[PDB]
Amino acid sequence: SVKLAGNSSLCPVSGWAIYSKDNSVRIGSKGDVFVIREPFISCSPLECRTFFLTQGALLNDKHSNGTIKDRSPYRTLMSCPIGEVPSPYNSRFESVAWSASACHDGINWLTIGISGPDNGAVAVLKYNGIITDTIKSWRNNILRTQESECACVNGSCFTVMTDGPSNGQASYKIFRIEKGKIVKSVEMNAPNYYYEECSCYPDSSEITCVCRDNWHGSNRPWVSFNQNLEYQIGYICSGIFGDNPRPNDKTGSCGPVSSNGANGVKGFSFKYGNGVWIGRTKSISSRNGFEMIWDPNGWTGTDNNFSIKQDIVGINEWSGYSGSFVQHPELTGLDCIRPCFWVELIRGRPKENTIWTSGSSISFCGVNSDTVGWSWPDGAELPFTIDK
Amino acid sequence: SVKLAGNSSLCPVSGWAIYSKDNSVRIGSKGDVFVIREPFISCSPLECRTFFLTQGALLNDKHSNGTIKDRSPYRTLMSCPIGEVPSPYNSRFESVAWSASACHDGINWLTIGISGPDNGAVAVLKYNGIITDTIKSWRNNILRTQESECACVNGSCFTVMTDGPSNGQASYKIFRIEKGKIVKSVEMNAPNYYYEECSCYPDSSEITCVCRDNWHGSNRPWVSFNQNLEYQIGYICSGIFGDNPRPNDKTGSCGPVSSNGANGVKGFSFKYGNGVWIGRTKSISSRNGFEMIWDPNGWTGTDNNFSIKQDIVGINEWSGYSGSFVQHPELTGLDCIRPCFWVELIRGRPKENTIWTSGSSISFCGVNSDTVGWSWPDGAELPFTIDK
Amino acid sequence: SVKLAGNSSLCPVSGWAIYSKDNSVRIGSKGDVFVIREPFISCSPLECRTFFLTQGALLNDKHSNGTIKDRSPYRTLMSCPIGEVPSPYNSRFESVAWSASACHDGINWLTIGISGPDNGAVAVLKYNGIITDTIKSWRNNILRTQESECACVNGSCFTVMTDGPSNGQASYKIFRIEKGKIVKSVEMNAPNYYYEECSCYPDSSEITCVCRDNWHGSNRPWVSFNQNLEYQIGYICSGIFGDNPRPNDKTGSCGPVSSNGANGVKGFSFKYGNGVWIGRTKSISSRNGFEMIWDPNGWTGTDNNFSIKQDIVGINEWSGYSGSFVQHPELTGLDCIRPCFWVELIRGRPKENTIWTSGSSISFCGVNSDTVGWSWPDGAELPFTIDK
Amino acid sequence: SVKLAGNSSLCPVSGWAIYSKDNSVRIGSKGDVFVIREPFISCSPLECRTFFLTQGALLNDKHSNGTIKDRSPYRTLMSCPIGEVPSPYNSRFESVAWSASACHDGINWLTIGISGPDNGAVAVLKYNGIITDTIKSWRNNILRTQESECACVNGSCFTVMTDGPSNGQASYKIFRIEKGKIVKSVEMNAPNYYYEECSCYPDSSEITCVCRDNWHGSNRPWVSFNQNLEYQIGYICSGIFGDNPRPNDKTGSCGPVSSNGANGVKGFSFKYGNGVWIGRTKSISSRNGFEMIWDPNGWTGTDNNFSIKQDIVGINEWSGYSGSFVQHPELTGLDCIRPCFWVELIRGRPKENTIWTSGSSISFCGVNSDTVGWSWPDGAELPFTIDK
Ligand SMILES: *[C@@H]1O[C@H](CO[C@@H]2O[C@@H](C)[C@@H](O)[C@@H](O)[C@@H]2O)[C@@H](O[C@@H]2O[C@H](CO)[C@@H](O[C@@H]3O[C@H](CO[C@H]4O[C@H](CO)[C@@H](O)[C@H](O)[C@@H]4O)[C@@H](O)[C@H](O)[C@@H]3O)[C@H](O)[C@H]2NC(C)=O)[C@H](O)[C@H]1NC(C)=O
Ligand SMILES: *[C@@H]1O[C@H](CO)[C@@H](O[C@@H]2O[C@H](CO)[C@@H](O)[C@H](O)[C@H]2NC(C)=O)[C@H](O)[C@H]1NC(C)=O
Ligand SMILES: CCC(CC)O[C@@H]1C=C(C(=O)O)C[C@H](N)[C@H]1NC(C)=O
Ligand SMILES: CCC(CC)O[C@@H]1C=C(C(=O)O)C[C@H](N)[C@H]1NC(C)=O
Ligand SMILES: CCC(CC)O[C@@H]1C=C(C(=O)O)C[C@H](N)[C@H]1NC(C)=O
Ligand SMILES: CCC(CC)O[C@@H]1C=C(C(=O)O)C[C@H](N)[C@H]1NC(C)=O
Ligand SMILES: *[C@@H]1O[C@H](CO)[C@@H](O)[C@H](O)[C@H]1NC(C)=O
Ligand SMILES: *[C@@H]1O[C@H](CO)[C@@H](O)[C@H](O)[C@H]1NC(C)=O
Ligand SMILES: *[C@@H]1O[C@H](CO)[C@@H](O)[C@H](O)[C@H]1NC(C)=O
Ligand SMILES: *[C@@H]1O[C@H](CO)[C@@H](O)[C@H](O)[C@H]1NC(C)=O
Ligand SMILES: *[C@@H]1O[C@H](CO)[C@@H](O)[C@H](O)[C@H]1NC(C)=O
Ligand SMILES: *[C@@H]1O[C@H](CO)[C@@H](O)[C@H](O)[C@H]1NC(C)=O
Ligand SMILES: *[C@@H]1O[C@H](CO)[C@@H](O)[C@H](O)[C@H]1NC(C)=O
Ligand SMILES: *[C@@H]1O[C@H](CO)[C@@H](O)[C@H](O)[C@H]1NC(C)=O
Ligand SMILES: *[C@@H]1O[C@H](CO)[C@@H](O)[C@H](O)[C@H]1NC(C)=O
Ligand SMILES: *[C@@H]1O[C@H](CO)[C@@H](O)[C@H](O)[C@H]1NC(C)=O
Ligand SMILES: [Ca+2]
Ligand SMILES: [Ca+2]
Ligand SMILES: [Ca+2]
Ligand SMILES: [Ca+2]
Ligand SMILES: [Ca+2]
Ligand SMILES: [Ca+2]
Ligand SMILES: [Ca+2]
Ligand SMILES: [Ca+2]
């Protein structure tokens, strides 16, 4: 075992090849599948795994009732192999958690699991399953983190957490973690900005995070930083607005776009010089559909012109959260860090007549070979037996 | 860990010893068993696995409704250990797929998973579960592949894909794949021939495939080739016709036999000089029964005389797809490549009064020791609870 | 990895410590557990496993109907870790089989699985899961074998099979198998004797088998042999009759005891010079209760006196088949071969009002430390939901 | 593999970080989850596992009826990975038992499983799953042991067993066990003391146990001993009484506190010089709530003054058994033995209107980083379908 180097560049990609689909909700109609949300993928040098926050309940059982609720003591972070349904019979226990991150440094898994009360939550860090550190809410208002993989470069792993309001200015901190021990943190000077649920990736020994502005931005904030936590901040300039909700595409801004700026959805994007691969919902108002857009000047330019669009979920089908993951050269044998993404397909409440809320997933990896647009939706027929 | 050599000849065999049976449909009446079709077996130097295309649904659940349908975004290629029922709790996720192939080169698994729309399908190629290449539809008309194992020789693996009409001339391509990367492909010049769902095996460093003529052939087409994809083509001459449907046995042809030629079923045969071991259904009109027939001049001769018949499934019992798989010397310690086969036992629609279609399997290995004819059918009592 | 020597003597034992209980039937009331009979235990140098003949059906499902039936094409030999319920989700497929044996030579697993028609059945032998030999019925009348572990000495494994009538003189053969290849077999000269379902163990480089006389013996036949298949034969002389059914205990015989001699139950016994540890039912007429008796002159003396009895299952509780297994010094680190046994607890037909027949198990290992008699019965409440 | 040294001292801790939660009862409403009680956690140098005593029945199935009952032949000691639900599909079978202990010496697991009748129970000792010894009841009155992990130092493992009345003076023995073989045992001279369900841990090469006085003590008894089983005895002096039931806090005693002394619950405490970390229920009269309390002079001082209290389960929520477990330097890489604990969250009879009694778990590890009080209760909604 050796540390992931994390020093090559992102592989340039022309399209996205489908990687996994788990059909969890479809299968949970009969089988024993966890009620989950906030799924994400992360890879070691040997395998890729789906992480997810369970609700301590299975689909189509009565304890699935009320799972629209975000935070409870029943929620646990757990993981299974990519593409498998998250079942009590195939899933490894990670942490007690209603917000979470994980990532593999090349040697062992780091996991971060926040539980406790809204006014004094605690992140428990584990390295190879052993508790190695904790960090407690500093603003006493729902300490929260990525809901996707943390990022590793040369034995140090990096994440972002937020504490404070979700409808106004909050506090955002960046952490450096080595063998599960926080060795440095910095609070971001980001007035008039808002970061949550950061999708962070390594690229040439530095970390880039694209996040959710729930306060007043329908474009996505970003923060990048080096191993010493010296950071830079911005918003994606493209007029192809990345958040949900959002306005129709028009002239963008390098600051937060206030039109339709309140609320949000967890998302991601990949920076390639001045350009950007944007993943987003197809609907401007609800979590429906998904598409990947290549905008060759979208990182720094404000026009709404793009070069490529690839359909992933159709506009009438349910989507939800999305995030980045990467495959490092140590895993693939390439000479670059490969970009991939997952989409959470949220089913049930609040949009459907169920007592429950849960998600299945799909993921894709970046390639330079031929690809195609389509729709790979969840496909469960709601309501279920328990609802009726 | 070492590449499969694939340079020895096929073991001569006098009969077929039963190797597995999963009883998947019988078990899925209560257990959590995927609805599947298109199963196949493939071996590494250490184990044999069953690969299959799920419908993203479990048996006796309402999501099994309409699983007569061949292609959807829910279908996934998964695998389990030979003879186990395909459950979400024992199945390894491979790829998102409504048509597939897989094989092991002696170092890692290659998997091939075709998904997307009928007019622009994409094969995703994975080596050790990492995406390593893609190939897209070149006739825009249901890109499709073997539904059985690809074949490997000295580090290269080979498969066949079809694109175009299923009731006429189509286009047929052969591929050389090393470590999941397509290193060469050739389009077959095969006018008035039709190939699909090819069953391919290695034999003396070369590949022989026996396929399905869905256009106008009630005997089976074949294609053989070397590692440079220089090929030869033909049809099995035996008057013991291999496809289903087909006419009653009579004088054969070394080109397509047009009588009952349209439509077909995936199948296989093994070439031994001028002779041929034929697997086929017992009914001439539907997928019922299965039998193995040794015809010592059937590869190249057109008479309907044969020397050995061994019963596998009784004529009143449902059958379906069948395909070759091999066990290499590296696995067996023999000095030859051992032929084996599997049979898909299809239950439900169109022939039975259910909302669903699914399959169990049985598999047999060639030996020169004493064997017996019998019937090992699926054994499920239809309809199921969900149908009623 | 080294061959089991098999050259030490049986360990002297004063009593039996409980080793495992799986509660299969109790648990299959709700969970997915196989309908099984003919369970047995066998150990490698690293673990012990339960082997069993499934009925290709789960408990409390409709396909359990009619499982009183002994032979069908749906029956499969499968194995799981000792003490775990036999489920499709924890069980490894071994062979298609309605009669069976298995044993580990120190290097790999040998398995023997008989399937096919009553008038021409075939035993398929596998070594590390690969077919290595077959042997076909020689009397065309239900080729059958041990339903317990075969016995291994220095790289050779030994079993017994019977072919012929179950109500009269039949034919009995002994086999020597190396790496799953039959290297020698002999037919026993045993007129007026009858051997089936032999429980065979190694002891000082020779094999001793205690078996079932279904023709005309209420005491148990035995056969012992050396590695060259030179054999000796006899019946257990003790007046503590070991078969079920049997008479009440009285003066025994060194030939078959005809009183209550027809029919039988698979059983075992362990020889210690002139003495014998007999495992048997508590009832003289049905498969109910179980007890272990030490009779210090019972191998060769005909009195009905014994020195020790240890209760295992109470007289009013269901028992069934039993058999020996051993733990070799390569596994335990002892300087002798440890004797152990399992009991099948048969539930359902013909004695209970169900559509099905199945069994759970218990096992014990011989020790010299303190032990106790009790009852560890099956404990399922019959009938089940599917019966009603 | 190397023996756990066990020679470092206990890590000083300032609070408890949440480590796991299995949600077993919530999940067993639909999933296949064992009815259990008496779980506990123990770790090897590679993993932590949950051990528990099943009732040989699954939740929401009719065989869970009457599971208030402590001792039966159906009860088995099994284990799974920490935080996973105890299911037949993820659980290792360990031993047949209605009382148990287990621990890992750095090389293999020792398991201890007591079954048989109340007047002659036998402890079966296993090392790496092989029977290596037994010990039988020496007072004929429910031989019983820890229900928590044994303690290991330099290849010796230690435990405590009780035999005799649970409402008066009984007999208490300590055992030294090497590779599953009892090498020494001592009967405790403890007149007017009562010990059972001991929680024992290593600390500087010596064992400290904190136990349950069921006779006449509402504080907890303790016994500490060296590797030769030379022991010292006493009761925790703190006026913060540790048992349940108990009186309200007031001046303590260094011998048994008779007020509310009869009856009790399994529990634990960690000694740090003259101080003590106490885990206890929040209710004085029933098994409800749980809290950790640091009393810097509570080992040897009788006042009811304490420094730190940390909430674990809220006072209106069901609690139950609790026990210590440790993580050795060999697992953690620390220079001290880390204390952890678990709490059994009992549901059903006698306090709720069900046919069954079962338990889920939560566990916590000691840290010197920031922590928080909260409530992590069982969370199931009773009654269940089977009760109605
Ligand atoms: C899904 O979940 C909802 C919401 O329920 C809440 O969360 C769930 C998970 C549980 O934790 C509940 O306890 C929570 O309430 C369910 O709605 C609840 O249904 C239950 C069952 O009917 C209701 O509980 C009953 O209420 C009865 C009415 O009592 C009230 O008035 C009487 C005077 O008549 C008075 O005595 C009492 O104090 C109440 O004020 C009561 O008689 C009975 O014993 C029982 O308590 C509960 O009120 C409902 N909650 C809400 C918020 O409406 C759904 O039933 C559930 N659906 C499914 C399909 O499972
Ligand atoms: C049982 O068999 C083993 C062989 O595996 C015998 O052990 C060997 O004996 C020879 C001397 O004849 C030595 O050269 C070897 O070193 C021994 N090998 C091992 C691994 O110990 C043993 O003598 C036989 N025991 C009995 C009881 O007959
Ligand atoms: C805490 C505020 C935050 C942003 C509105 O809510 C998140 C939004 C969510 C959402 O918009 O779907 C669901 C997340 N599970 C939740 N996070 C937490 C920690 O509860
Ligand atoms: C698409 C043409 C082809 C031949 C008619 O269809 C096959 C027929 C099938 C059949 O005869 O059973 C099943 C195959 N799953 C299907 N293949 C695809 C890719 O859908
Ligand atoms: C074949 C004769 C034999 C002895 C009567 O029947 C056995 C009796 C059985 C029994 O007495 O319970 C069950 C065995 N499964 C069966 N063996 C086979 C091969 O069917
Ligand atoms: C046997 C006396 C002892 C103390 C009353 O009983 C314990 C009480 C129990 C309890 O208070 O919950 C549960 C334990 N399973 C039980 N132990 C046994 C061996 O049955
Ligand atoms: C990246 O790191 C590797 C491994 O330490 C090193 O050998 C290589 O020189 C580095 N490459 C670049 C481009 O910095
Ligand atoms: C990577 O980390 C190691 C250990 O701290 C350090 O020695 C090395 O200089 C780092 N490498 C680079 C290229 O920064
Ligand atoms: C086949 O290949 C192996 C491995 O490369 C080689 O050693 C052997 O000589 C070859 N066999 C034949 C029949 O050519
Ligand atoms: C099957 O599909 C048809 C068509 O939509 C529908 O009418 C019927 O209700 C379905 N049956 C089940 C069991 O879902
Ligand atoms: C097998 O492939 C390797 C790599 O191309 C090559 O070195 C070797 O010559 C090949 N052997 C044969 C028989 O073609
Ligand atoms: C069991 O099988 C018989 C066939 O003999 C059938 O008549 C009966 O209805 C079946 N019973 C159940 C409960 O399915
Ligand atoms: C054990 O088997 C080996 C291999 O056949 C043989 O050489 C040896 O003589 C055997 N030993 C005994 C004691 O039979
Ligand atoms: C603890 O044991 C280790 C391993 O044997 C030893 O090296 C060390 O000296 C010991 N420490 C103490 C404090 O006794
Ligand atoms: C349930 O358990 C009780 C013990 O409390 C037992 O005596 C009774 O017979 C059982 N009742 C049913 C309906 O199974
Ligand atoms: C640990 O055990 C070994 C083996 O008995 C012994 O020789 C050694 O002295 C022991 N170490 C200590 C510190 O007791
Ligand atoms: Ca927003
Ligand atoms: Ca642009
Ligand atoms: Ca045809
Ligand atoms: Ca011919
Ligand atoms: Ca008899
Ligand atoms: Ca006698
Ligand atoms: Ca007490
Ligand atoms: Ca105090």
mmCIF file of C-alpha atoms in Angstrom, chain B residues 239-366:
data_model
loop_
_atom_site.group_PDB
_atom_site.id
_atom_site.type_symbol
_atom_site.label_atom_id
_atom_site.label_comp_id
_atom_site.label_asym_id
_atom_site.label_seq_id
_atom_site.Cartn_x
_atom_site.Cartn_y
_atom_site.Cartn_z
ATOM 1 C CA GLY B 239 -29.159 -32.197 -41.701
ATOM 2 C CA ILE B 240 -29.615 -32.215 -37.900
ATOM 3 C CA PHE B 241 -30.694 -28.564 -37.886
ATOM 4 C CA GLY B 242 -29.560 -26.566 -34.860
ATOM 5 C CA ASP B 243 -31.820 -23.477 -34.649
ATOM 6 C CA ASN B 244 -35.342 -23.095 -33.242
ATOM 7 C CA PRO B 245 -37.615 -22.876 -35.134
ATOM 8 C CA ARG B 246 -36.460 -25.342 -37.779
ATOM 9 C CA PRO B 247 -37.902 -28.078 -39.996
ATOM 10 C CA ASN B 248 -37.724 -31.797 -39.253
ATOM 11 C CA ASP B 249 -34.286 -33.238 -39.961
ATOM 12 C CA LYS B 250 -33.526 -33.979 -43.628
ATOM 13 C CA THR B 251 -30.687 -33.131 -46.035
ATOM 14 C CA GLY B 252 -28.813 -30.048 -44.806
ATOM 15 C CA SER B 253 -26.894 -27.251 -46.535
ATOM 16 C CA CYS B 254 -23.494 -25.599 -46.144
ATOM 17 C CA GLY B 255 -25.257 -22.211 -46.576
ATOM 18 C CA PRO B 256 -28.412 -20.939 -44.797
ATOM 19 C CA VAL B 257 -31.380 -23.389 -44.744
ATOM 20 C CA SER B 258 -34.322 -21.099 -45.551
ATOM 21 C CA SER B 259 -37.053 -23.523 -44.425
ATOM 22 C CA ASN B 260 -38.348 -22.230 -41.080
ATOM 23 C CA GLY B 261 -35.253 -20.017 -41.260
ATOM 24 C CA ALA B 262 -36.659 -16.761 -39.925
ATOM 25 C CA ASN B 263 -36.441 -16.227 -36.195
ATOM 26 C CA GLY B 264 -34.212 -18.452 -33.993
ATOM 27 C CA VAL B 265 -32.674 -18.957 -30.559
ATOM 28 C CA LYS B 266 -29.139 -18.373 -29.206
ATOM 29 C CA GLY B 267 -27.162 -21.607 -29.399
ATOM 30 C CA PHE B 268 -23.838 -23.307 -29.717
ATOM 31 C CA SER B 269 -21.918 -26.217 -31.204
ATOM 32 C CA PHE B 270 -18.394 -27.639 -30.853
ATOM 33 C CA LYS B 271 -16.268 -28.496 -33.895
ATOM 34 C CA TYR B 272 -14.084 -31.592 -33.869
ATOM 35 C CA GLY B 273 -12.594 -31.796 -37.398
ATOM 36 C CA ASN B 274 -15.456 -32.833 -39.723
ATOM 37 C CA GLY B 275 -17.663 -33.713 -36.728
ATOM 38 C CA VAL B 276 -19.832 -31.565 -34.486
ATOM 39 C CA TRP B 277 -21.466 -31.761 -31.032
ATOM 40 C CA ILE B 278 -24.775 -29.988 -31.466
ATOM 41 C CA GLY B 279 -26.867 -28.653 -28.585
ATOM 42 C CA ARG B 280 -30.441 -27.917 -29.564
ATOM 43 C CA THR B 281 -34.053 -27.832 -28.488
ATOM 44 C CA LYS B 282 -36.166 -31.043 -28.854
ATOM 45 C CA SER B 283 -39.167 -29.213 -30.310
ATOM 46 C CA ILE B 284 -38.854 -27.902 -33.901
ATOM 47 C CA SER B 285 -41.298 -25.030 -33.284
ATOM 48 C CA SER B 286 -40.827 -23.773 -29.724
ATOM 49 C CA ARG B 287 -38.259 -23.467 -26.961
ATOM 50 C CA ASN B 288 -38.946 -26.883 -25.395
ATOM 51 C CA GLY B 289 -36.514 -29.574 -24.468
ATOM 52 C CA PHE B 290 -32.850 -29.803 -25.032
ATOM 53 C CA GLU B 291 -30.513 -32.556 -26.286
ATOM 54 C CA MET B 292 -26.893 -32.983 -27.252
ATOM 55 C CA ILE B 293 -26.142 -34.807 -30.562
ATOM 56 C CA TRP B 294 -22.727 -36.034 -31.745
ATOM 57 C CA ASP B 295 -22.633 -36.025 -35.542
ATOM 58 C CA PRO B 296 -19.200 -37.323 -36.651
ATOM 59 C CA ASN B 297 -19.453 -35.616 -40.115
ATOM 60 C CA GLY B 298 -21.990 -32.872 -39.304
ATOM 61 C CA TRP B 299 -19.689 -29.850 -39.550
ATOM 62 C CA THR B 300 -19.082 -30.428 -43.297
ATOM 63 C CA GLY B 301 -21.571 -33.179 -44.360
ATOM 64 C CA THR B 302 -25.263 -32.660 -45.140
ATOM 65 C CA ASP B 303 -26.855 -35.997 -44.199
ATOM 66 C CA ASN B 304 -29.130 -36.222 -41.129
ATOM 67 C CA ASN B 305 -27.392 -39.262 -39.609
ATOM 68 C CA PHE B 306 -25.765 -38.931 -36.156
ATOM 69 C CA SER B 307 -24.119 -41.330 -33.794
ATOM 70 C CA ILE B 308 -24.922 -40.140 -30.161
ATOM 71 C CA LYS B 309 -27.923 -38.358 -28.590
ATOM 72 C CA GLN B 310 -28.019 -37.469 -24.894
ATOM 73 C CA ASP B 311 -31.201 -36.078 -23.355
ATOM 74 C CA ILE B 312 -30.905 -32.914 -21.207
ATOM 75 C CA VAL B 313 -34.425 -31.463 -20.862
ATOM 76 C CA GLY B 314 -37.613 -33.331 -21.733
ATOM 77 C CA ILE B 315 -39.630 -32.261 -24.787
ATOM 78 C CA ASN B 316 -42.606 -31.100 -22.687
ATOM 79 C CA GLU B 317 -40.366 -28.856 -20.547
ATOM 80 C CA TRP B 318 -39.445 -25.232 -21.310
ATOM 81 C CA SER B 319 -35.922 -24.539 -22.617
ATOM 82 C CA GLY B 320 -34.430 -21.370 -24.162
ATOM 83 C CA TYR B 321 -30.946 -19.951 -24.761
ATOM 84 C CA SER B 322 -27.882 -22.139 -24.634
ATOM 85 C CA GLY B 323 -24.187 -21.273 -24.954
ATOM 86 C CA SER B 324 -20.687 -22.659 -24.757
ATOM 87 C CA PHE B 325 -18.180 -22.060 -21.971
ATOM 88 C CA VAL B 326 -14.721 -23.483 -21.589
ATOM 89 C CA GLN B 327 -12.466 -24.513 -18.763
ATOM 90 C CA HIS B 328 -8.841 -23.857 -19.678
ATOM 91 C CA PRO B 329 -5.864 -26.061 -18.553
ATOM 92 C CA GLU B 330 -4.869 -23.251 -16.156
ATOM 93 C CA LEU B 331 -8.098 -24.017 -14.207
ATOM 94 C CA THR B 332 -8.379 -27.796 -14.674
ATOM 95 C CA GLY B 333 -4.776 -29.001 -14.887
ATOM 96 C CA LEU B 334 -5.722 -30.988 -18.033
ATOM 97 C CA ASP B 335 -3.724 -30.781 -21.308
ATOM 98 C CA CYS B 336 -6.710 -29.565 -23.386
ATOM 99 C CA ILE B 337 -9.490 -26.964 -23.347
ATOM 100 C CA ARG B 338 -12.607 -28.605 -21.795
ATOM 101 C CA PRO B 339 -15.965 -27.754 -23.443
ATOM 102 C CA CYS B 340 -18.947 -27.089 -21.212
ATOM 103 C CA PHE B 341 -22.413 -25.655 -21.940
ATOM 104 C CA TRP B 342 -25.319 -24.039 -20.141
ATOM 105 C CA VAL B 343 -29.032 -23.935 -20.906
ATOM 106 C CA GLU B 344 -31.376 -21.110 -19.991
ATOM 107 C CA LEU B 345 -34.745 -22.464 -18.786
ATOM 108 C CA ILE B 346 -37.227 -19.696 -19.637
ATOM 109 C CA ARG B 347 -40.410 -19.272 -17.654
ATOM 110 C CA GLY B 348 -43.365 -16.920 -18.017
ATOM 111 C CA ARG B 349 -44.251 -14.893 -21.126
ATOM 112 C CA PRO B 350 -44.934 -15.377 -23.968
ATOM 113 C CA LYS B 351 -45.863 -19.034 -23.442
ATOM 114 C CA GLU B 352 -47.264 -18.878 -19.905
ATOM 115 C CA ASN B 353 -49.952 -16.760 -18.284
ATOM 116 C CA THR B 354 -47.860 -14.448 -16.141
ATOM 117 C CA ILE B 355 -46.999 -10.746 -16.043
ATOM 118 C CA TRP B 356 -43.268 -11.595 -16.118
ATOM 119 C CA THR B 357 -40.529 -13.515 -17.896
ATOM 120 C CA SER B 358 -37.482 -14.984 -16.105
ATOM 121 C CA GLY B 359 -35.034 -17.875 -16.431
ATOM 122 C CA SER B 360 -33.143 -20.439 -14.368
ATOM 123 C CA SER B 361 -30.066 -22.361 -15.601
ATOM 124 C CA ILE B 362 -28.453 -25.759 -15.840
ATOM 125 C CA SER B 363 -24.909 -26.516 -17.009
ATOM 126 C CA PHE B 364 -22.974 -29.548 -18.081
ATOM 127 C CA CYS B 365 -19.302 -30.378 -18.720
ATOM 128 C CA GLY B 366 -17.820 -32.658 -21.375
#
